[PDB]
Amino acid sequence: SLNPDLANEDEVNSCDYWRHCAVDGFLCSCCGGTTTTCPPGSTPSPISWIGTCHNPHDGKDYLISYHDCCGKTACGRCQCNTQTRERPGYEFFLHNDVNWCMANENSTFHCTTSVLVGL
Amino acid sequence: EVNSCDYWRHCAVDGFLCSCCGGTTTTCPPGSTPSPISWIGTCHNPHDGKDYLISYHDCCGKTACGRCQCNTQTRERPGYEFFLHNDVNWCMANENSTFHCTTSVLVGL
Amino acid sequence: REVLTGGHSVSAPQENRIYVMDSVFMHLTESRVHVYDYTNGKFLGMVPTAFNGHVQVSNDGKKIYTMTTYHERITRGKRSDVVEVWDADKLTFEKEISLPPKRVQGLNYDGLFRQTTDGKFIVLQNASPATSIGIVDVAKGDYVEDVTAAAGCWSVIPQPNRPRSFMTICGDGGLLTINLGEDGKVASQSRSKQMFSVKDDPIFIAPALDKDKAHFVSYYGNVYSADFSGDEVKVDGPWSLLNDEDKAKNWVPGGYNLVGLHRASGRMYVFMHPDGKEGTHKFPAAEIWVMDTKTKQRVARIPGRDALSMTIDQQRNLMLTLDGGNVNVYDISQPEPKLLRTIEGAAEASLQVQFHPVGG
Amino acid sequence: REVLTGGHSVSAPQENRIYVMDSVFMHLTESRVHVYDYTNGKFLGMVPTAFNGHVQVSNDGKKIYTMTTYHERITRGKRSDVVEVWDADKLTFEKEISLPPKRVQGLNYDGLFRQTTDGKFIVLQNASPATSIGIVDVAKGDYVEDVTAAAGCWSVIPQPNRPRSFMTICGDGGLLTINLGEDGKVASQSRSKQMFSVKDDPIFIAPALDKDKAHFVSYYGNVYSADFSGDEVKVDGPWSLLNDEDKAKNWVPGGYNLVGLHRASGRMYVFMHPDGKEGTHKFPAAEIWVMDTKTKQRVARIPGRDALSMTIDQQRNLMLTLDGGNVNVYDISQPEPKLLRTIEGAAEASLQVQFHPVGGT
């Protein structure tokens, strides 16, 4: 449950996968990358929105960092718009209606993901 | 009827009908520029039974209109008969070549 | 012999026009504004807005302002963030105004790109990701002020009772008011007392804006108000949108540009859905509720048509709603809104529609 | 615990890869190449190509070439037509090569953007709207000069039996052959006799290309041939694709990149549809016909799946077809093709698919 690369591809590519609970964008795992790797030729955002998601498999709660991959045009696949614990822009780093590629060398948004930070 | 791909004057349109895009059959939508050059089609008038020359000028300098896409090919020929050919952008020589929509301008018999 | 011509103006009067900001999220580098006639659904024209454009019409109705980002080679090369001024009737580009490369990139909430009541200044949200408010002097065509005092705040709520004043919502749950001088530089500012608890009852940023006050709805269906009849903003709330039956079925607000105010009556319009819980704050409307803001009670409810965003025209007593793709037109001259028509396929991915201003 | 990283290569080997050129006609300023694994339908990555991109892979398999148009402010400002060189495994931009602002803007026929057999020159169609052929020196990263001899002609057919020669189809119904020097300028040229009547039997531009000859199909279902085994091209035809029954139901070819040749067998593949008449030359395939070019007879016919474009791989005996959005993979090692799989949603508006090259020396 903590290691998407060992899981069923169709499970991790679903908007319902437990760690994707505040994703707004295209899942990088459907775009030629994986949960934790940008597709070839796209660049990780150094900043992100964050939050926690509940892992129903082990019953624990985890800190998730939602980095975008940047510098290629929209992937277009596996669009998600989940909003658990998401807050407006006056809680900026909890907010997912902004482009987290905004400070990259090229801000064009390609795909997003959910990086597991810790418990 | 002029917004339908089957309107007789649209017999060699490959593009968006400008009449669905804030223009008319013979005028570009606001802020888009007519191409000076065009491909030509010969279309059959269903009223008088005669063929007319229709000049297909694109409207240029705005992004794709996206409405009333047509792909009709009556008497259309490949790029070795270049001015009868509609698989190219007739905005190619404009100040801005971005293709917005296509007009169907009646020339004559 | 027919001749194809250019140079034409929009074919319907300004008072018929609405602006549907199509993000085209699937192809976000080709966002655009679609111009429609609300009276008959006719497509009138469009304005290209490159990557994630924002749009507003000048208060005097003469120009369209867009905000966007370019790069020399789109996905590489130097960044240029800009405001563009377009003629409203010819839908032609007139002027570019350079911004620092930090304009907000994000979905089209109204409060990210606004203008002062007097129309002399454009007021926009920046994020680098540190937040600040940028001021553009329209007459000069220049970025003239960067309001760093608004760090930790978000969005711009113009005060319709003052010429060059606006508010922003801050991370302390209060409002920061900025009063600009005639040069567009900050002339004074003030901070309200806490209006809402950020942790316990977060508000949606979209205001229900009156001439001298604004109302905000919360994630749990409460209402907060900010009264700016004086120089110092006075804040109050909550009162609940919900009665006991409503609470039993867990009704809460949801959407984006989700509220509106009919100023002559005090009626507030809010998108609502049942079975609310954490994570449902952007759900499409099951219903539109019509609230009397003086009595703090609901007066009517109608089907929501899965709408997400709305806007109101005061003088014609109209409300538009938008579900992402389709625009619904309502007559709100009486307490129960009446559906007049739906404009299907107005956009691929729009969360913002606006009327052409007619007041001058 | 986890860290998001970039810098990765495409996950599947080159021999699994295909390139679907998505014009995205509804949003043509955001055209792109979609890279797919044909063995399992997996999306592998993409290359952005701005306004009406064109694409090819280098003959050596190492680089992807795109051709596109930029303007400083997209819909206004200075025009820049370019070829870009991208790394095939990293899908990253490496180099921009400046073109004169007249590269062809149009749908993605193969012959608009090609290369010499030796891989040393990119050879592209210009239209201002006057036509010429542009030559790009790959080693130098430079535009050489217009091939002005090709005025009134259209499209580029490389000659696979020579290192730097190609032909084009001219308005007189013949072929112009261009032989380049080591510097990419025209060293010599020749023009064939008339191959087809432009008025009475116009041909589709897409060649069924062999090592030393090319076949072309016509609007009325005839076949023409150009033999370039010698320095002078010899032309012939027509012969008909159609038997008596075929003619009775008005079968004719239709599509865009609508033919292909399996060189080892001489089998020619052609999209066909019944009830042909003026105006149906770009109709989707009702069927694919498989012709023996030696015996000049059909050896198979199968459902067309509304295909418009195809490509053939000689090294793995495959044919891809494309209906605008979906790609079908066929085994063509026997006279009757066998459908292996369909990749759904590979593009929004594509009329061109290509394999990643394997071998081909």
Ligand SMILES: NCCc1c[nH]c2ccccc12
């Ligand atoms: N993290 C996605 C933010 C987003 C949603 N809709 C948008 C439109 C434009 C830019 C960003 C967005």
Ligand SMILES: NCCc1c[nH]c2ccccc12
């Ligand atoms: N006049 C239409 C030409 C056309 C069809 N598909 C295209 C793609 C790109 C550019 C032009 C075209």
